[PDB]
Amino acid sequence: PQITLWQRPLVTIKIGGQLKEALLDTGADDTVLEEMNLPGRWKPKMIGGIGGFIKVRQYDQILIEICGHKVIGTVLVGPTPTNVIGRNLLTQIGCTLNF
Amino acid sequence: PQITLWQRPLVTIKIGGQLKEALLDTGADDTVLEEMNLPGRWKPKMIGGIGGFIKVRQYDQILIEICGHKVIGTVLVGPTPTNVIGRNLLTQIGCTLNF
Numbered sequence: 001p002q003i004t005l006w007q008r009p010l011v012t013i014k015i016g017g018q019l020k021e022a023l024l025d026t027g028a029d030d031t032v033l034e035e036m037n038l039p040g041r042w043k044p045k046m047i048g049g050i051g052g053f054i055k056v057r058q059y060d061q062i063l064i065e066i067c068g069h070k071v072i073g074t075v076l077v078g079p080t081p082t083n084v085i086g087r088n089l090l091t092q093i094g095c096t097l098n099f
Numbered sequence: 100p101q102i103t104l105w106q107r108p109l110v111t112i113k114i115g116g117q118l119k120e121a122l123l124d125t126g127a128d129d130t131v132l133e134e135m136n137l138p139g140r141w142k143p144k145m146i147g148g149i150g151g152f153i154k155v156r157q158y159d160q161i162l163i164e165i166c167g168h169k170v171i172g173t174v175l176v177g178p179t180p181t182n183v184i185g186r187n188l189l190t191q192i193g194c195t196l197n198f
């Protein structure tokens with residue numbers, strides 16, 4: 001699809017068998033989701049943005065369906081104020097900016 | 100142009116007569132730039148992201164040339180770790196996400 005930017009570019013995702021809403025975020029190198037459990041092992045990590053940093057848990061090889069495009073990648077989980085789909089996954093669904 | 104997301108979507112901007120680089124950031128409602136002076140008045144404001152909040156100075160009706168497209172809009176200035184062009188301006192250059 002073509003997503004305009006007059007509203008937040010939110011999409012529905014399915015991950016770990018749950019339905020969630022997430023922001024398509026070209027400004028995020030990574031994909032960061034609020035608290036949730038996920039199949040498998042993880043390594044701790046920190047990430048930053050505008051106001052500082054947070055600790056997240058990093059899970060590799062997670063399956064996620066973003067608008068029905070399945071992708072497998074690293075998903076980070078922790079106290080982010082909002083679910084964000086970052087460039088690690090945006091590249092995998094072929095997402096581009098266009099103007 | 101069409102901008103892929105394998106690299107950060109950095110673009111050159113011209114603002115306040117200065118040349119800067121900034122990230123086209125669909126995850127940002129607003130445009131936030133590191134410290135710089137700007138013609139005119141402003142009002143203080145706070146903004147958040149991952150990590151927390153920062154104080155910024157909000158300037159209205161600023162002209163900005165983003166990849167050669169002129170737009171006029173609010174620009175926030177303050178301690179962000181990176182220059183970001185948010186949706187407030189992305190709409191004005193007609194920027195869309197496409198997949």
Ligand SMILES: CC(C)(C)OC(=O)N[C@@H](Cc1ccccc1)C(=O)C[C@@H](Cc1ccccc1)C(=O)N[C@@H](CCC(N)=O)C(=O)N[C@@H](Cc1ccccc1)C(N)=O
Pocket residue numbers: 023025026027028029030031032046047048049050081082084086122124125126127128129130131146147148149180181183185
């Ligand atoms: C208007 C405003 C600027 C205030 O909005 C936002 O914060 N939007 C959020 C997403 C968000 C939306 C809504 C609510 C909360 C968050 C993001 O698009 C912002 C972007 C802007 C940014 C990019 C690079 C460096 C600094 C900042 C952001 O925080 N991206 C992050 C998302 C976290 C992640 N790992 O993907 C990002 O790429 N972080 C990187 C880069 C980084 C290094 C050091 C310090 C800061 C950042 C990281 N791996 O930690």
Ligand SMILES: [Cl-]
Pocket residue numbers: 072073074088089
């Ligand atoms: Cl990945």
Ligand SMILES: [Cl-]
Pocket residue numbers: 171172173187188
């Ligand atoms: Cl504006």
